[PDB]
Design a protein around this ligand. Structure first.
Ligand SMILES: CC(C)NC(=O)COc1cccc(-c2nc(Nc3ccc4[nH]ncc4c3)c3ccccc3n2)c1
Length: 327
């Protein structure tokens, strides 16, 4: 059977906290006043929630209200507990309140408002300096949540709200986030197809915080190479083939051999045999201004098949790529 795996960092944070911290099923919700909040306009819908621009009539401040569909299946408590654990962490969306929605009869999460500018207008229009700056701000969020025993599991441009005017970033949508417990097997049906780590795609369940660092590498590659998305799978199988056409099949086989993973036999007809490509093959006249030796070295150390070999968020923040960012 598969060889087990453990994170190389923050392995035992949860084992040493009182059950109060990670036992989200035991958590009792403190309800605020639903009458404090007036919905202004629908902003978005996902498969698990509807999001609204709202006003807090007690202070006239803009808020965002996320009304959970009942389909959450009660995992509302994990999201609430994670949001409360992380509250006030650097670049973590701030949960202001939890009220009972009178219509849905489900919890409505009240968040601070970020005046977001659209990613499809932003992340493919930023400067070299701004890519470095915002990546550093995302790393602060990821090292904070990892240090607090939490993996986000849905890092992608849509879950990063940026107020480009105030140089303000928040990591949002913690509805897939989970507490890391060493030796625990997790559901591989997390993250969005283009950001899914190889561990998910080969059905390796004993994964950890390092899944977020793969997702972040997918975001960086799309930004520096101006290619959305970078790994453009037609489905979850083709997603691994797209990765293997860049990183090569020999390192893929070494990875699944290390963890004693058997590839789905569906791959025998579609994977082929691929060399690792040099990152310079993706450089062209339209994206060269965003590419440096430091950018490629950093990307190279995120986009590794072996989840244990990837930079941690804290190691990533030490990388030369960020030396130019004002701290
Ligand atoms: C034409 C528009 C542009 N196209 C859309 O149809 C969606 O647009 C938006 C715009 C802004 C935010 C969101 C949004 N936010 C979400 N949480 C959220 C939470 C706290 C927040 N503080 N400030 C912003 C914000 C957003 C969200 C969560 C789950 C599912 C979907 C979500 N969606 C969507």
């Amino acid at each position: 059977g598969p060889v087990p795996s453990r994170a190389r960092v923050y392995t035992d944070v949860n084992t040493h906290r009182p059950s109060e911290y990670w036992d989200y099923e035991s958590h009792v919700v403190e309800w605020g006043n639903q009458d404090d909040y007036q919905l202004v306009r629908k902003l978005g819908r996902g498969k698990y929630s509807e999001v609204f621009e709202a006003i807090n009539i007690t202070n006239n401040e803009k808020v965002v209200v996320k009304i959970l569909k009942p389909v959450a299946a009660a995992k509302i408590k994990r999201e609430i507990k994670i949001l409360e654990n992380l509250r006030g962490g650097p670049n973590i969306i701030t949960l202001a309140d939890i009220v009972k929605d009178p219509v849905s009869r489900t919890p409505a999460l009240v968040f601070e408002h970020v005046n977001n500018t659209d990613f499809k207008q932003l992340y493919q229009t930023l400067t070299d300096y701004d890519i470095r700056f915002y990546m550093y701000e995302i790393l602060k969020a990821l090292d904070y949540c990892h240090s607090m025993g939490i993996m986000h599991r849905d890092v992608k441009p849509h879950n990063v709200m940026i107020d480009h005017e105030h140089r303000k970033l928040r990591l949002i949508d913690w509805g897939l986030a989970e507490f890391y417990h060493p030796g625990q097997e997790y559901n591989v049906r997390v993250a969005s197809r283009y950001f899914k780590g190889p561990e998910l795609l080969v059905d390796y369940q004993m994964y950890d915080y390092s899944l977020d660092m793969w997702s972040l590498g997918c975001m960086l590659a799309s930004m520096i190479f101006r290619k959305e998305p970078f790994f453009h799978g037609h489905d979850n199988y083709d997603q691994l083939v797209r990765i293997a056409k860049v990183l090569g099949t020999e390192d893929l086989y070494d990875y699944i051999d290390k963890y004693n993973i058997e590839l789905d036999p569906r791959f025998n007809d579609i994977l082929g045999r691929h060399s690792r490509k040099r990152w310079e093959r993706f450089v062209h006249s339209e994206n060269q201004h965003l590419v440096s030796p430091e950018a490629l070295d950093f990307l190279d150390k995120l986009l590794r098949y072996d989840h244990q070999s990837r930079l941690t968020a804290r190691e990533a923040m030490e990388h030369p790529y960020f030396y130019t960012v004002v701290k």
